[PDB]
């Protein structure tokens, strides 16, 4: 029992039972209003009578009797009609889900959720490292261009030196020197041999 109708009131903005209570305190008050109408109308009509009074505390208790009858039948009828109102209206048939919470049909586990947000932070930081990794690689390459050009420059100096050497006679001073000493070694050998003869 005791049904709060927490979903039936989510769509309407009020509990159906409270609305039925407001409807009741409306209808009953209207009934007693028309009873005040008939009572004071039979009271004003009473002043113009021949014979004796047959009134006024007598003519009121009768209105109280018919008022008790009307409260019985009106109360029962309102109870059944209110049950009807809570059955066919103001009721979410449980067959139907409101569009307010359309996505909550498929639940998402909390392990997958904490795992997912943790993976989100991890991938944020991971990207943040990959970016400056790109920056450092591009910087090391851009700076590496300079040392490559400098080594190419020194190699260009050595090639130009072998070109200035290739011209003027002696390409590389390796076969020349070993031929300069040998022909000199003879020039000394024939020098001594001509100093021993000149005596």
């Amino acid at each position: 029992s005791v049904d709060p109708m927490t979903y039936e009131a989510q769509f309407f903005g009020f509990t159906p039972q409270t609305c039925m209570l407001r409807i009741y305190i409306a209808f009953q008050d209207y009934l007693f209003e028309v009873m005040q109408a008939v009572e004071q109308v039979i009271l004003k009509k009473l002043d113009g009578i021949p014979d004796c009074d047959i009134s006024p505390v007598q003519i009121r208790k009768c209105t109280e009797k018919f008022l008790c009858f009307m409260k019985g039948h009106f109360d029962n009828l309102f109870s059944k009609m209110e049950q009807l109102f809570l059955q066919l209206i103001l009721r979410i048939p449980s067959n139907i889900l409101l569009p307010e919470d359309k996505c909550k049909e498929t639940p998402y586990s909390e392990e997958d959720f904490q795992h997912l947000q943790k993976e989100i932070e991890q991938l944020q930081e991971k990207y943040k490292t990959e970016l400056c990794t790109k920056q450092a690689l591009l910087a090391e390459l851009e700076e590496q261009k300079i040392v490559q050009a400098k080594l190419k420059q020194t190699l260009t100096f050595f090639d130009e030196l072998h070109n200035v050497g290739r011209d003027h006679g002696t390409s590389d001073f390796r076969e020349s020197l070993v031929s300069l000493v040998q022909n000199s070694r003879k020039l000394q050998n024939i020098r001594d041999n001509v100093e021993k003869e000149s005596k």
């Binding site: 609305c19 109102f85 690689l137 490559q148």
Partner: protein, 173 residues
């Protein structure tokens, strides 16, 4: 498939049909005897005004609550959602008393798309860093193989030092 406004009007109309029937003229007469002996036509007029003003008053009340907060449009919306969804026949999702479960259920997709966005971005950055790093490695290969050639020709020029050595050796007595 009856509009809930029509069922409401039928419940009010039938409720009055059973109140005006329960409030029989005999029931208003046998108790209001003292008055009924004289002018049995004045009593009829008073009962008529009573019952008519009563039923028009209560019908005016329900007509006033239908315009209370646009309740006709609310009930028409409910009929719409019922017809729009009466295809499942299965018990719908009623909100369990765990706010974090529902909130995570609605928040899940907007976190999935973020996780996969950052996934694609970090994979693009990963591939770019891969190829770029390969270019760096090739550059290192080139600079080292250049240093080797510089040293090679340098030693090639330092080789004739010995040639000068035995040159000055044989040039001295």
């Amino acid at each position: 498939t009856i509009s809930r406004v029509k069922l409401l009007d039928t419940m009010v109309d039938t409720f009055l049909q059973k109140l005006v029937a329960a409030g029989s003229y005999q029931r208003f007469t046998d108790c209001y005897k003292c008055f009924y002996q004289l002018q049995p036509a004045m009593t009829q007029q008073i009962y008529d005004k009573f019952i008519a003003q009563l039923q028009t008053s209560i019908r005016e009340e329900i007509s006033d609550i239908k315009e209370e907060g646009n309740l006709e449009a609310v009930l028409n919306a409910l009929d719409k959602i019922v017809e729009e969804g009466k295809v499942r026949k299965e018990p719908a999702w009623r909100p369990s008393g765990i706010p974090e479960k529902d909130l995570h259920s609605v928040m899940a997709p907007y976190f999935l798309q973020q996780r996969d966005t950052l996934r694609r971005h970090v994979q693009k950055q990963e591939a770019e860093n891969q190829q770029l790093a390969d270019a760096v490695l090739a550059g290192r290969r080139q600079v080292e193989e250049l240093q080797l050639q510089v040293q090679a020709q340098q030693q090639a020029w330092q080789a004739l030092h010995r040639e000068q050595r035995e040159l000055v050796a044989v040039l001295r007595e």
